[PDB]
């Protein structure tokens, strides 16, 4: 019944189907075979050295399998005809697919490429262009080949006795068509064949996702022990909601899903808002509307105050635009596919969306609301051709008295001026001429002629870039030349650091400007449920009416000059207190228009993908005889080149459209005057543009309809506004006039905010893709498991799947099934390093690198199939660990000796016990600067060489610096060659480090002297005693598996800040701020320098020791006081090694905080500050395992008896982890510390 016994039979059966002649034993750590293909056999034929048997050996091992080398069997990969056992179905979706195909008739500039038919022996001017696009657009790179994904569902559908539709349309693709593509399993980036259609990998990636989405639901529906979902009155089947959706996209899935995701997201926002009894989850927090310290009460219901408000004309107009958006996506697919049926289950819900209720306390309404958010992720990573279009500023709106353009431009001048003043109070100033060159390392140049040169030329220019996104179409990224970005670095620096803090008060009548705007970081620091608690409590409040407008194509109306001049007017007038000092000869007012000049951002030439027209061939050669030029600009491989646009537009249209065309030089590609995403002021400026617009929003509402709609909060983030207001009348006519004056303010600014995008609702909040509904948490999961952003190279396979399980902690936290999230990792633990070995071996002997023989030079590489239960063997024993009973608990080596002593885990961890100390090891790979360096570095580099070299060869730790500059020089050649060149070196290392591997007995629970881990708690016993309250805590995030619902029930959501971040990580906060310190060195780096010397003779010998790290000099103050603090304050000198409590579900719980100790911990008082953390980090995993089993909630107490022999073993083992014997003569630390002097008298 356990996941380790039932699930391991399935992943073994996948290997029993994939490599069909493999005898697999579970109790072996990893079995080894090999296989080869003749793509490399043909190559050394061409160099002269012919081979003995060309394909005779291939005949020997196809189906007889009778040959095996060195005793190691040789087994072939399965063909495509057999991955579904030759099954066939009716599959009405598949016959919709095959009539929705079209050859040689597509528009060559288009966003998401349609169904092109592959006909063999066709032309090399169209079909090579279509093969050029699909090689860039349709790529399924990642960590797992897509072939074994299709075999995995074939094995998984049999056990659940349920057939997914993604396999039904795939099983008809195997009997009529042989092989869709040839993905090489070594690199996963090459797809060199399409047999019937160019969009065949998109056909599978939307099918290998379609199958998991209904295995996720059907497993979850039995966990809630309900038959089907329940819209507010009627029964509804969730799989029919997806099968009605999968048929509609299947003509053109990247285009259909991008226009159908808008009514699906809008439906979940406005569901339970119009019903008269409304059930909320009563919350309580601070007086500010943005306070995050929230306390939850039980569920209750209340009468709706806004019942008659939804009879208005704002919602009735907004609903028919969304019912149109359903119908336009339908009519585009009713003709391109043969189907006459569409969406019959969803259309019955949108006709009455407001008045139907939604109750979160029943699970049959929370799964359905989560499912519709997770519908849209089948066609992940929309990769799209973009075209190069210009400014076209005749459409740019000129400032007028009748328009608000000049009033917007004078508002935003007073906001950059105000951000500079309020950064002066937080000690954020401009950079100085002294540290101008030192402060240039914040990015990864400066010449008086290179700074005066322009870029509005065909000869020299700027070059665009592009990077992908999860569901959206591919957004651009701007690459600016580094000569003219440093003038933007010097003047936008006290704005990047100022809005970097997380705290803020958002009141409109407050005078300050920093709290009301906020720019987050790359990763969400903390959880998502934890730091979005201000969104939850305002959907649970009867008197908050939130307004959140949306700007469609924000840059096209940021293109206007009104925010360009008004920003630069406020830059110049605020540099007036800095008007005397000169930057390298010239003033500061001259250099701001070197980063915001005319040939910098006003009018610059940009080169993207080119314009191109589809024409005939006979008229092409009659004109191309005069203009055959190249060399100025390049042309894609399908297209035929000409010189200019003016000879390319005269022959433009053709009924046959045989051959393509492209202008190389005479194009005049693109000129843009718009705030770039690449500048240092991207997220600072456009969020201030929402502030200048949003302040004009409150004025016209207050001047046309006064007394109504008072404003209480103002949150401005990237391309979003969020007003927390309250409405003072439930009127049908008056509210219709207030909602009209909001759109008239945006339209008279220049933008066009859609009435279907604008949100004016009482009981629903969306903010930065976090949906809050009626006091609870409705989650989406757009993160996916098949595709990826770029091709991923598995360099640290110990640390890759340890990082991949973090993105599987989040998935089950949004409602994915817990055990289905175990089966995915147990599949994904065997198929990672299978093709990372160079040459073949013979077992129980040496490992052959060179062969020089015709037999073994055919069997090139090996296969390494690890056991599926390598997920559960803990770290430090050459395999990564996650616990089977709960995914959020880190399996460590002290947890392995505990989890076998518990009676409720003798059945689950019975097959785990036989594979420990059985697994193979892990593929664990590991001039200008004379100006841009601190004077700690320049004095150390301009030294006499007789003094500079003694810090390099004999002595010195020196983890950052000139050799790290060489590592920074190794980081810039890293991307192609240095990753590949050392990959030839680690493989010769890994064969020796595998042949010298002996599976060693006598596991140890301990660490070195100068560090300690969570395994320190095994010195003492632990007695589960006491009794606590069995009160079920209340929490907003419903929709969890029972392995996660019971951890949040017994242990509530946290209410304070966690204390377990030790003072070793308090100085990491000092090293987190500096980006010249953040990406390079940290606490494990800086404590090794304290390991080289403690207890010096003067503090003036103390401040200077980290200038010898040659990074900074200011933060040696924080290392002056804290070492003086640890000379005053007690400390255990050791560090803390851990890998636990970092995933975003553990940060939400009330574990590892100061209020967690006071009820769940009882420890002896003779323990230091970093020893009580090692007990508490042990104590967190014990209680989370105590709750996820069903064991009774007790108070964990570590006990020290009076057994005078056992009191001696503790005083012997606490001593050696505090002070080292031999290393005292290395550090020359004094033993007269107060903490280490107590150890004589602690336990006695």
């Amino acid at each position: 019944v356990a996941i380790t016994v039932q699930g391991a039979q399935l992943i073994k059966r996948v290997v029993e189907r994939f490599y069909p002649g493999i005898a697999f034993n579970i109790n072996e750590g990893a079995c080894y075979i090999y296989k080869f293909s003749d793509h490399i056999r043909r190559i050394r034929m061409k160099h002269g050295t012919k081979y003995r048997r060309q394909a005779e050996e291939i005949i020997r091992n196809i189906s007889l399998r009778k040959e095996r080398l060195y005793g190691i069997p040789v087994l072939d990969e399965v063909e495509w005809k057999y991955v579904f056992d030759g099954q066939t179905f009716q599959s009405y979706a598949f016959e919709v697919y095959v009539n929705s195909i079209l050859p040689w008739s597509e528009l060559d500039p288009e966003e998401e490429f349609l169904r092109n038919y592959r006909v063999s022996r066709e032309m090399t001017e169209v079909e090579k262009f279509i093969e050029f696009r699909a090689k860039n657009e349709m790529q399924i790179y990642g960590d797992i080949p897509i072939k074994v994904w299709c075999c995995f569902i074939n094995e998984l559908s049999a056990e659940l006795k349920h057939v997914p539709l993604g396999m039904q349309v795939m099983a008809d693709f195997v009997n009529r068509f042989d092989s869709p593509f040839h993905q090489g399993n070594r690199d996963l980036s090459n797809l060199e064949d399409f047999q019937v259609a160019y969009t065949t990998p998109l056909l599978f990636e939307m099918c290998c996702m379609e199958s998991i989405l209904e295995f996720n639901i059907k497993m979850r529906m039995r966990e809630e022990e309900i038959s089907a979902l329940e819209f507010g009155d009627m029964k509804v089947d969730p799989v029919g909601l997806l099968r009605e959706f999968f048929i509609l996209c299947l003509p053109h899935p990247k285009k259909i899903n991008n226009v159908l995701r808008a009514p699906y997201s809008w439906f979940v926002k406005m569901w339970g808002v119009g019903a008269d009894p409304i059930v909320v989850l009563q919350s309580t927090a601070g007086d500010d509307r943005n306070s995050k310290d929230v306390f939850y009460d039980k569920f209750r219901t209340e009468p709706n105050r806004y019942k008659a408000l939804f009879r208005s004309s704002f919602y009735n107009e907004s609903r028919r635009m969304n019912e149109e958006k359903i119908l336009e996506a339908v009519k585009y697919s009713q003709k391109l596919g043969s189907h006459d049926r569409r969406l019959p289950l969803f259309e019955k819900m949108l006709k009455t969306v407001y008045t139907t209720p939604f109750y979160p306390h029943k699970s049959s309404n929370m799964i359905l609301a989560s499912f519709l958010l997770s519908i849209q992720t089948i066609t992940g990573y929309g990769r799209a051709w973009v075209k190069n279009v210009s400014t076209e500023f005749d459409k740019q709106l000129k400032p007028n008295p009748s328009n608000l353009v000049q009033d917007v431009s004078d508002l935003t001048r007073e906001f950059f001026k105000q951000a500079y003043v309020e950064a002066k109070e937080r000690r954020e100033e401009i950079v100085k001429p002294e540290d101008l060159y030192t402060s240039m390392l914040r990015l990864a140049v400066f010449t008086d002629e290179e700074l005066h040169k322009k870029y509005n030329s065909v000869e020299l220019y700027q070059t665009k870039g592009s990077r992908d996104v999860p569901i959206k179409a591919t957004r651009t990224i701007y690459s600016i030349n580094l000569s003219v970005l440093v003038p933007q670095l010097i003047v936008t620096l006290p704005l990047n650091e100022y809005f970097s803090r997380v705290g803020g008060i958002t009141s409109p009548d407050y005078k300050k400007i920093g709290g009301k705007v906020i720019v987050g970081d790359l990763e969400a620091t903390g959880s998502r449920v934890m730091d979005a608690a201000d969104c939850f409590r305002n959907s649970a409040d009867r008197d908050i009416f939130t307004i959140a407008i949306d700007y469609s194509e924000y840059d096209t109306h940021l293109t206007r000059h009104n925010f360009r001049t008004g920003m630069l007017q406020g830059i110049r007038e605020a540099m007036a207190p800095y008007r005397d000092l000169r930057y390298e000869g010239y003033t500061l007012e001259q250099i701001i228009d070197f980063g915001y000049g005319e040939g910098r951002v006003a009018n610059t030439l940009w080169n993207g993908k080119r314009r191109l027209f589809k024409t005939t061939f006979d008229a092409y050669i009659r004109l191309d005889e005069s203009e055959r030029d190249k060399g100025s600009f390049k042309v894609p491989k399908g297209v035929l080149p000409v010189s200019s646009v003016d000879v390319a537009n005269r022959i433009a249209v053709d009924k046959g459209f045989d051959t393509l065309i492209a202008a190389t030089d005479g194009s005049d590609l693109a000129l843009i005057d718009t705030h770039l995403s690449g500048e240092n002021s991207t997220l600072i400026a456009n969020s201030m543009h929402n502030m200048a617009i949003g302040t004009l929003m409150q004025r016209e509402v207050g001047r046309e309809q006064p007394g109504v709609l008072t404003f209480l909060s103002e949150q401005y983030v990237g391309d979003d506004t969020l007003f927390y207001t309250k409405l003072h009348t439930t009127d049908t006519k008056v509210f219709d006039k207030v909602a009209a004056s909001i759109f008239d303010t945006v339209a008279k600014c220049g933008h066009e905010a859609s009435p279907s995008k604008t949100m004016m609702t009482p009981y629903s909040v969306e903010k930065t893709q976090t949906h809050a509904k009626q006091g609870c948490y409705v989650p989406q999961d757009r993160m996916m498991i098949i595709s990826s952003e770029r091709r991923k190279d598995i360099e640290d396979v110990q640390g890759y799947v340890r990082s991949q399980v973090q993105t599987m902690i989040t998935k089950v936290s949004r409602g994915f099934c817990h055990d289905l999230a175990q089966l995915i990792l147990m599949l994904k633990t065997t198929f990672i390093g299978a093709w990372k070995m160079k040459r073949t071996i013979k077992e129980d002997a040496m490992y052959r690198d060179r062969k020089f023989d015709s037999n073994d030079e055919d069997g090139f590489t090996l296969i390494q199939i690890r056991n599926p239960l390598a997920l559960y063997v803990p770290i430090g024993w050459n395999g990564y660990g996650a616990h089977p009973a709960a995914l959020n608990i880190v399996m460590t080596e002290e947890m392995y000796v505990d989890s076998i002593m518990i009676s409720k885990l003798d059945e689950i961890m019975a097959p785990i016990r036989r594979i420990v100390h059985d697994i193979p090891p892990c593929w664990n790979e590991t001039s200008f600067f004379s100006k841009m360096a601190r004077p700690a570095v320049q004095a150390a580099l301009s030294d006499p060489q007789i003094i500079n070299l003694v810090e390099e060869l004999p002595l010195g730790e020196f983890s950052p610096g000139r050799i790290s500059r060489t590592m920074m020089h190794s980081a810039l050649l890293k991307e192609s060659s240095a990753r590949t060149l050392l990959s030839s070196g680690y493989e010769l290392e890994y064969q020796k480090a595998l042949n010298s591997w002996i599976t060693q007995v006598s596991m140890r629970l301990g660490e070195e002297s100068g560090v300690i881990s969570t395994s320190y708690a095994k010195l003492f016993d632990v007695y589960f005693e006491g009794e606590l309250d069995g009160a079920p805590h209340m929490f907003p995030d419903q929709n969890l598996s029972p392995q996660f619902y019971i951890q949040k029930m017994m242990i509530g959501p946290r209410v304070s800040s966690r204390v377990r971040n030790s003072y070793v990580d308090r100085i990491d906060v000092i090293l987190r701020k500096d980006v010249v310190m953040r990406g390079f060195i940290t606490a494990n780096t800086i404590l090794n320098v304290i390991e080289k010397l403690g207890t010096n003779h003067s503090v003036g010998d103390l401040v200077t020791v980290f200038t010898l790290m040659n990074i900074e000099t200011r933060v040696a103050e924080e290392l002056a006081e804290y070492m003086t603090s640890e000379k005053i304050r007690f400390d255990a000198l050791k560090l803390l090694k851990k890998g636990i409590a970092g995933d975003e579900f553990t940060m939400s719980l009330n574990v590892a905080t100061q209020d967690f100790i006071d009820t769940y911990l009882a420890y002896p008082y003779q323990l230091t500050k970093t020893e009580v953390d090692a007990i508490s980090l042990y104590c967190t995993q014990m209680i989370m395992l105590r709750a996820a089993l069903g064991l009774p909630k007790k108070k964990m107490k570590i006990v020290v008896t009076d057994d005078a022999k056992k009191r001696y073993k503790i005083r012997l083992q606490r001593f050696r982890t505090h002070v080292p014997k031999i290393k005292v003569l290395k550090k020359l630390i004094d033993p007269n510390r107060m903490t280490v002097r107590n150890l004589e008298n602690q336990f006695v």
Partner: peptide, 18 residues
Amino acid sequence: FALQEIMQKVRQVQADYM
């Protein structure tokens, strides 16, 4: 007394450059 002299050599030739 090797590592004690390593710092005293650099901290003297740091002064004559600044």
